[PDB]
Amino acid sequence: PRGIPYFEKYAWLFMRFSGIALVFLALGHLFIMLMWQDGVYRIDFNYVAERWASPFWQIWDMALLWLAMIHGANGMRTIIGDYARKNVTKFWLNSLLLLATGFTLVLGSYVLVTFDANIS
Amino acid sequence: LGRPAPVMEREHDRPAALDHPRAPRKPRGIPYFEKYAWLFMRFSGIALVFLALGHLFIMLMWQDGVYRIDFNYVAERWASPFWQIWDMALLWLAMIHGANGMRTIIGDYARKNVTKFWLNSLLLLATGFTLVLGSYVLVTFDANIS
Amino acid sequence: AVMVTLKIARFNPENPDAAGWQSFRVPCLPSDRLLNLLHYVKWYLDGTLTFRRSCAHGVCGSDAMRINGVNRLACKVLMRDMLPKNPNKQLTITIEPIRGLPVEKDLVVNMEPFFDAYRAVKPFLVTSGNPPTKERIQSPTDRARYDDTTKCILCACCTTSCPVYWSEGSYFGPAAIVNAHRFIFDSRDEAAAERLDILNEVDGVWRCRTTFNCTEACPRGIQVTQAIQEVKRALMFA
Amino acid sequence: NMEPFFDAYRAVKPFLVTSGNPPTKERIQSPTDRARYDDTTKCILCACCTTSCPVYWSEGSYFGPAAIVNAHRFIFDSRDEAAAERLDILNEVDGVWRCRTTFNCTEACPRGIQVTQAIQEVKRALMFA
Amino acid sequence: TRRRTLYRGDPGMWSWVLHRITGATIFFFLFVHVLDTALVRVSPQAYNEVIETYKTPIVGLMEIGLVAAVLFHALNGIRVILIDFWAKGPRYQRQMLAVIAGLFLVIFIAAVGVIGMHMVER
Amino acid sequence: IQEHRYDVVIVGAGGAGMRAAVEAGPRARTAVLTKLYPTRSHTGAAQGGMCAALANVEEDNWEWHTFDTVKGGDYLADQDAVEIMCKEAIDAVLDLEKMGMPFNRTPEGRIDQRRFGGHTRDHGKAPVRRACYAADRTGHMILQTLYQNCVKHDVEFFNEFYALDIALTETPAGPVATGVIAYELATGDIHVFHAKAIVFATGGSGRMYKTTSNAHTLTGDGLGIVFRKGLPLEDMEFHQFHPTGLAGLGILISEAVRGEGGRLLNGEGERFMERYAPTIVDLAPRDIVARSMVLEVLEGRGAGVPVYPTCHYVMGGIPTTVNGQVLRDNTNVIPGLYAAGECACVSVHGANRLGTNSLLDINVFGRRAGIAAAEYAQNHNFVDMPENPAEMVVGWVGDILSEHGNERVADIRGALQQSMDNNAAVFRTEETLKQALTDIHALKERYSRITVHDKGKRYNSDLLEAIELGFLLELAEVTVVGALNRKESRGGHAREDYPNRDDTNYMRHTMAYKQGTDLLSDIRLDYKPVVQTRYEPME
Ligand SMILES: Cc1cc2nc3c(=O)[nH]c(=O)nc-3n(C[C@H](O)[C@H](O)[C@H](O)COP(=O)(O)OP(=O)(O)OC[C@H]3O[C@@H](n4cnc5c(N)ncnc54)[C@H](O)[C@@H]3O)c2cc1C
Ligand SMILES: CCCCCCCCCCCCCCCC(=O)OC[C@H](COP(=O)(O)O)OC(=O)CCCCCCCCCCCCCCC
Ligand code: HEM
Ligand code: HEM
Ligand code: HEM
Ligand code: HEM
Ligand code: SF4
Ligand code: SF4
Ligand code: F3S
Ligand code: F3S
Ligand code: FES
């Protein structure tokens, strides 16, 4: 009874299920980005704007962002719990992790939701 | 000769000592989750009376029922904050209500704990898919799609 | 004497495990109950027929069985105002054991699941530790609070009619919650918190789908689902 | 100093908890329920497994492969009345969810016990129950 | 072994069976409604196509059945909520059930009359 | 054949049995055997209150209670036992209330009491309002409370175990009780419980009468066991016949006429109890009311809601001491054998039972027998065991199962009950008692060839019905020979041949010993003196 009951079981299950989903999400992202037509050498604002004019790719990128960030944040929670010796260090490192994860999710969600092709 | 002993093992993943006759029955989940799922079904039902029946009335009975419905009708209705918020609340309340109800249904029709686990996972997957798809369509809709 | 037909669901646990209904013809005076006809069957015609019964008419709850569909507690089936007394014609009464508890022989079930669920809600008085030697005081209006659940004879006519009890999982049942209400709503008790914490799980009181089969089956008239409601309200207003 | 090891051992309650009036004649158990908690009754408590667990070298207080083996033995025993309480002991932050599915324990056991499959069975008993 | 037994209990039991069945019906329909409405983010013509195929007489009868499902679920759910909250609920169960039978009758025949007029005028 | 080893073994889980178990549970390693489930017991059929001199709504001391008990018993009770019962009755009721029992409360809120039957103010002055109660259901609450306490203290229950015999190993200093041979209904197995002490709380035996109020399971088996082992039975001709008895069948109406002005009218719209007993119209003793009803329905002034007397209670049973030890003489005691409840005859009730004293009896003396047996078991050690003690029981079951006679158990039992309720009922005569003796001997030779049609082993109720008919026949003959011996009219035993109490020749308990081993045997009758302290006979 050190924390919230049944939180570790569900964090464990979430890592498994988000892994199953992230296989497709992350590897399809990497494929389509790096080895489809010219890889990075085709990427620019116009490429992003014509990709994000599609419900498919919009939902793909939002699911990728949220699943990847919660997955990584839980994994780093585990890493901190295994490497931090002092309880004050563990507290402040978990707080820094929570802050950075929240900031990245907020920024990525803002950009996706608010993106408009015609900006200038 | 005697009577062979009864096997207590339900399935491989189930400790028989969990259904021991003299074993203490103690809660097997998150505390106070059932109380709040129960209360949610009650309150979301109270809200869904208005939301769902007003939706059905306005769709089927108002002017020409389904025989007036098309893209331009949808685009005129969703140009109003009233109907946008109405449909978002309807989607979220209805999906969480139905998903919790089917949680109950699975829980009392599934015989094995593995079946229960995988049916609850399929249910959570389908509910999440419908919620994100409906939310996407509502949030990012533009009448000038073509 | 009317010569009723009884259709009993037979089951021999050892010699054959292949048996279904059997029909017996038994005379029926109007001042009869169903236990009298079951006795006629067991004494004269059959004698492999095994049921439970103790009392004359001081209710103990022994002979709950499923008669014509409903849980009826045989000794009280009253066998008097036969509607086919209007059109003279063949009658039939269908008898079978109660449902949800394992059958041990025809009309005898295994009540140990029922009693193990009963004595899991701590059905006894728990107090502080300084007995007053002088009859713990309690108001005549604190008395009438837990009343009406002190009439449970533990017959399982309620528990074995709950669809949620027929279903999967492990529901406590209406009778365990009646006998827990009896103590939760007792003034001179010091464990209402732990009993309400026992009844606050997934397999506790939130599995009642508000069917009133229990209220309709109880032979004492206990309002079993009103008791279940009062437990739910004591749990949510806390 | 084996006392940390044995303290983690005698913290999963590694004894049979039962009713309070024994049956005078050896309470019954099937040859099918008996062959279930087999293969974890072979533990000689040498700590060759717990002291090869990187999760045990790490911080916090992981129970360890050996405590989880000797708790599997009692959780999957029919004639026990504290399976749920043991599973609730192993369901904490430093219980069975800290296994990173390294098979160092299985590779190190001198009796050949399949320590990590015992850990997996406890995990699945917590998932599906 | 398995035996087939009709228990023949309270009318609250059949109310609960119908509640469960109609609720699951609405759940599955809602899965489908949300997909075919998501079709509104691809084009006007695709949406117009699929809903023009949702304006047939078979699907009209199905929409009447769905009105019946939603109506009974809503009314019996009001009854269930009252039983759980109102402290005199369990007494007046089985009078709430007659009330909602009557309400279902009137609202349903009115709605089916309006919908049948719409389906005739076409 | 299975073997168990327990310190204390209680046979019966009714009021007295579960009270003794509550007491002797913490002390020793106790087991309880029941042919029913604990809460299915006759005690739960009790509706009247439980009387004690608490003086919450009025004033009374236990001395008026003691006098009323002694005078109700028609001067055959033992004054030492009556004294003990009352002055422990106060604390018996208080401890029931402190165990959880829901009594009805008084405007203050301590315990409400009400008036009942033949309870007097002081030596026959006015009602006194003694009887505590819980509802229209007092015995049910007492039984539930005792069972909930046995669940709290985790008592071991062996449900549906028909205890069929006991094993008396003969030490050089007399016999000693070592084990109980029981029959598990569910499996057909014989079990032997070897114990240090044995408590018998098996309730009464009223099912040898056609019209009776007792359960279908009150055949009388502790009495039959103790009587077959060679031990005596005391005062068995004293059966109480409740007056109000559903003239058709036999159910009890103890509630209405006692509570309110229910007048007993005979045929014509005429009351009779005002002429058969003045100074109280119809709240007279039950034996007097029943004699009056039977007399008038016999003299031709009855009808033909109706009522008729029903056998209700047996005032005899296993003769014990105030601590529960079973006697084997007028003085000696079987070591390690106790008895409590309605099977035991401490002779508190004597020749007529005063209402609401039975629940009192079972509480007080079940607690006493429990602590006594616990002390004995913790003091002494296991004694011995005879050669395979279950030999007789297994041979008995086997040979009653294994052949096909030509008689019907239901027919034999119906004939017995009809004959008893015809002859050995409210009014007895020498010719009727001799007729009943010949009838019972004929049925005892017919019982020699019966058919158990089941032959199975799992749940064999037909076998046990035959076995219980055996006990019914033994107890019927005991009752008839006792009632034919006692040539007087005291309490429940009335005789038209000698209709006046003989205080000089028959103020003693009758004790009966069985001679042979088979059913047809001889009954030798000895006498036991009645103890007296202060109260002396008077009409
Ligand atoms: C209808 C009725 C109403 C009554 N009302 C009142 C009243 O209002 N007030 C009052 O004071 N008295 C009343 N009495 C009488 C009073 O209840 C009895 O004196 C008392 O209940 C006797 O109970 P007991 O504990 O001796 O055993 P019982 O409660 O009679 O039961 C005996 C128990 O022993 C066990 N047992 C019996 N035989 C065997 C066997 N062969 N093997 C194994 N186990 C066995 C059974 O499991 C059973 O539970 C009433 C009696 C009846 C029949
Ligand atoms: C918790 C679970 C959360 C799930 C989130 C995972 C999402 C990962 C990516 C999925 C994106 C789905 C959005 C669909 C948008 C789209 O394809 O539509 C966008 C497409 C453009 O796709 P492309 O540019 O990639 O070719 O527009 C079209 O022209 C499509 C023609 C017809 C397609 C009909 C699809 C409408 C709805 C049907 C959905 C099918 C699902 C069936 C389930 C039974
Ligand atoms: C060389 C490798 C990669 C390149 C060149 C690349 C490039 C891009 C591009 C071009 C976009 C936005 C345009 C669009 O989505 O169509 C993007 C967004 C995104 N990428 Fe990558 N990517 C790479 C690897 C990854 C990896 C490994 C991940 C996660 C594991 C990832 C996750 C994301 C996410 C979540 C977004 C959404 C950004 C937002 O919502 O603001 N990418 N990346
Ligand atoms: C954005 C992409 C990803 C990020 C940021 C990420 C990050 C992490 C981190 C930091 C961990 C912790 C490792 C540890 O605790 O030892 C982890 C664990 C894990 N990852 Fe990912 N990962 C990603 C993609 C994936 C993918 C594509 C899969 C495919 C299956 C996957 C499966 C897993 C699993 C199962 C774990 C749990 C490991 C364990 O518990 O031992 N991950 N992830
Ligand atoms: C024949 C019956 C029905 C018809 C013809 C119908 C038609 C529609 C229409 C026209 C829309 C979207 C256009 C707008 O919102 O103005 C819609 C969307 C929606 N409907 Fe229905 N509807 C029916 C029944 C239902 C029912 C019974 C429910 C819920 C139980 C429901 C819930 C919803 C929701 C939540 C949305 C939002 C879709 C989204 O957010 O993507 N509808 N349906
Ligand atoms: C329209 C107004 C609605 C009301 C008043 C309402 C009310 C209720 C209530 C009170 C329950 C709990 C029943 C119980 O626990 O016994 C329930 C269950 C349920 N609801 Fe609703 N609901 C409504 C709409 C919906 C909708 C729109 C859906 C699905 C999209 C739905 C699906 C379900 C399901 C599947 C159950 C489970 C049935 C059961 O477990 O017996 N309901 N409803
Ligand atoms: S509640 Fe009514 S029905 Fe359920 S057990 Fe007690 S008495 Fe029998
Ligand atoms: S290694 Fe094998 S034996 Fe040694 S402790 Fe770990 S498990 Fe027990
Ligand atoms: S029978 Fe069953 S579900 Fe509810 S009200 Fe009665 S309990
Ligand atoms: S060594 Fe360690 S982390 Fe897991 S599988 Fe074996 S325990
Ligand atoms: S026999 Fe006791 S209740 Fe029917």
Numbering used by the authors:
A (entry chain H): 37 to 156
B (entry chain D): 11 to 156
C (entry chain B): 23 to 260
D (entry chain K): 132 to 260
E (entry chain C): 15 to 136
F (entry chain A): 2 to 305, 347 to 581
The authors write:
Complex II is both a functional member of the oxidative phosphorylation pathway and the Krebs cycle, thus linking these two energy-harvesting processes. Members of the complex II superfamily are identified as succinate:quinone oxidoreductases (SQRs; or succinate dehydrogenases, SDHs) or quinol:fumarate oxidoreductases (QFRs; or fumarate reductases, FRDs) according to the preferred direction of reaction. No matter the direction, SQRs and QFRs share a common architecture with a large soluble domain and a smaller integral-membrane domain. They are comprised of a soluble flavin-containing subunit, an iron-sulfur cluster-containing subunit, either one or two transmembrane subunits and either zero, one, or two b-type heme groups. Diheme-containing SQRs generally perform menaquinone-linked succinate oxidation, a thermodynamically unfavorable reaction.
In the present study, we obtained a 2.8 Å cryo-electron microscopy (cryo-EM) structure of a trimeric form of an Sdh2 protein from M. smegmatis, which will help us to understand the mechanism of this catalytic process in the diheme-containing SQRs. The dimensions of the Sdh2 trimer are 110 Å in width and 105 Å in height, adopting a mushroom-like shape. Within the trimer, each of the three assemblies contains four canonical proteins: an FAD (flavin adenine dinucleotide)-binding protein (SdhA), an iron-sulfur protein (SdhB), and two membrane-anchored proteins (SdhC and SdhD), each with three transmembrane helices. Here, we have identified a 3 kDa subunit SdhF, which has only one transmembrane helix for its secondary structure, which is located near the transmembrane helix I of SdhC. However, the equivalent QP-binding pocket in M. smegmatis Sdh2 structure is completely blocked by the SdhF subunit, making this site totally inaccessible from the outside. Two b-type hemes, denoted as bP heme and bD heme based on their proximity to the hydrophilic subunits, are located in the membrane-spanning regions of the subunits SdhC and SdhD, and their axial ligands are His D107–His C87 and His D65–His C47, respectively. Fifteen phospholipid molecules and six menaquinone/menaquinols are all clearly observed in the structure, which is in agreement with MS. In the present structure, cardiolipin (CL), phosphatidylethanolamine (PE), phosphatidylinositol (PI), and phosphatidic acid (PA) molecules are mainly distributed in the cleft in the transmembrane space formed by neighboring subunits, playing roles in mediating the interaction of subunits within protomers of the assembly and interactions between neighboring protomers of the assembly. The bound MK/MKH2 interacts with the side chains of Gln-D94, Ile-D95, Met-D98, Trp-D102, and Leu-D103 of transmembrane helix V in one protomer, and the Val-D142, Ser-D145, Tyr-D146, Val-D149, and Thr-D150 of transmembrane helix VI in an adjacent protomer of the assembly.
